[PDB]
């Protein structure tokens, strides 16, 4: 996260880090005690991933962590890495053993199909991750969160030559400065309502990090809510 503030311990209990070939390479969010959501481009064919929940500082041990392993990688059927690396960027991670919820680990709420689009239309959204703080620079050690406003679709298509599909939205500021970066991809984009938080996006990609004209593009979870509830049911 570029231009983000430090997250207090417990402020984002749904946050989840992903470890594999490189430690802390992507983020994730807790659906329930057994399932994690992340970007499909973070986990490809034959990937050795472990999921750590309840994390604040990566290198420090705060005894609030819950380390688990993935045993079933569920990518969306419409995802094709050979066509587009971010078309239908969503994935499901089934853990080996069901977690136990507390104060530092908590699933994120997911509404139905219609409302998930309503919560997104509010405008304000929060993103968090352990990715790069600067463009091609150092990676964050503590959880960094950032509030980003929803930019209209008409402005987003005219800002980049790459195509923006229907199941993707854009968010960010005009003068750059505050934007997600590499490493944050896979984590949560959430909007709050009267205290309760509801998942509405996943960090997908963007042109560099924090630049005028460019915006962070996210995945529209509203188009996959019915697919998330049916696959993560108990």
């Amino acid at each position, epitope marked *: 996260v570029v231009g983000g503030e430090d997250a207090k311990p417990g402020q984002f209990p749904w946050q989840v880090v992903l470890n594999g070939k490189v430690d802390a390479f992507c983020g994730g969010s807790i659906v329930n005690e057994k399932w994690i959501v992340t970007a499909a481009h973070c986990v490809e064919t034959g990937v050795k991933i472990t999921v750590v929940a309840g994390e604040h500082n990566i290198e420090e041990t705060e005894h609030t962590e819950q380390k688990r392993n993935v045993i079933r990688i569920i990518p969306h059927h419409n995802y094709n890495a050979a066509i*587009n690396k971010y078309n239908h960027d969503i994935a499901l991670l089934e853990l080996d053993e069901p977690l136990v919820l507390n104060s530092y680990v908590t699933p994120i709420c997911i509404a139905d199909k219609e409302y998930t689009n309503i919560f997104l239309k509010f405008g304000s959204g929060y993103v968090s991750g352990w990715g790069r703080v600067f463009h091609k620079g150092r990676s964050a050690l503590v959880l960094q969160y950032l509030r980003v406003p929803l930019v209209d679709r008409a402005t987003c298509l*005219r*800002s*980049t*030559k790459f*195509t923006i599909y229907n199941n993707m939205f854009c968010a960010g500021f005009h003068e750059g400065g505050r934007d997600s970066c590499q490493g944050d991809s896979g984590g949560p984009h959430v909007t709050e309502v009267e205290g309760t938080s509801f998942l509405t996006g996943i960090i997908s990609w963007g042109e560099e990090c924090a630049m005028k004209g460019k915006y962070g593009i996210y995945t529209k979870v509203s188009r996959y809510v019915n697919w998330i509830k049916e696959k993560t049911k108990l």
Partner: T-cell receptor
Amino acid sequence: EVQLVESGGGLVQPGRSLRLSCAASGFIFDDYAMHWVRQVPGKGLEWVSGISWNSDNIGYVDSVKGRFTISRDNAKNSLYLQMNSLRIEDTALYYCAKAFGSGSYYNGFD
Amino acid sequence: DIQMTQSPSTLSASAGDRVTISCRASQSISSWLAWYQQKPGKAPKLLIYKASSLESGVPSRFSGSGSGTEFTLTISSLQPDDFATYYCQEYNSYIRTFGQGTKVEIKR
């Protein structure tokens, strides 16, 4: 400077086919979308078809939808247009246009 | 889809005058409008984009204004070289409808 050279125009019977070539030069051909725009002497300027930077997004005007085909060769820096089942109403001057700024598919031409 | 209407169809003015060309849209294209100038026998060249932005290299005597459904183009201090047909174009939709164009004649 930026230069776009058309070719392949001429006279053809109704129902036949040609193939226009637009050779680009003086800019990064890979970072800009390209379009075909015709000037009909009775109508005026009219956008005919457009292609994205990597042949991903393709759009046609309703009059040529199903008869015209647009393609590009980023290695050769060339844009092509394949006209099929040509009608007398297709007579016009066919310009080659490149999007400005960010090279977006929904951008105007410079 | 979106009907672009230019006004006037043609006009004549002397050198050093101030010209105003209007361009009205049937809907609301926000600020997605471009102005082109085509001299006889020449290809159209981009002048003003995004309603009010000026393309690099274009003289400062050209100015663009307007937002929403009404747009105007202004040529301060008319020059004989500015004889051409000026077109307005919206790029809000994928059709990119052009205007009917306005021919600018010179009075001498």
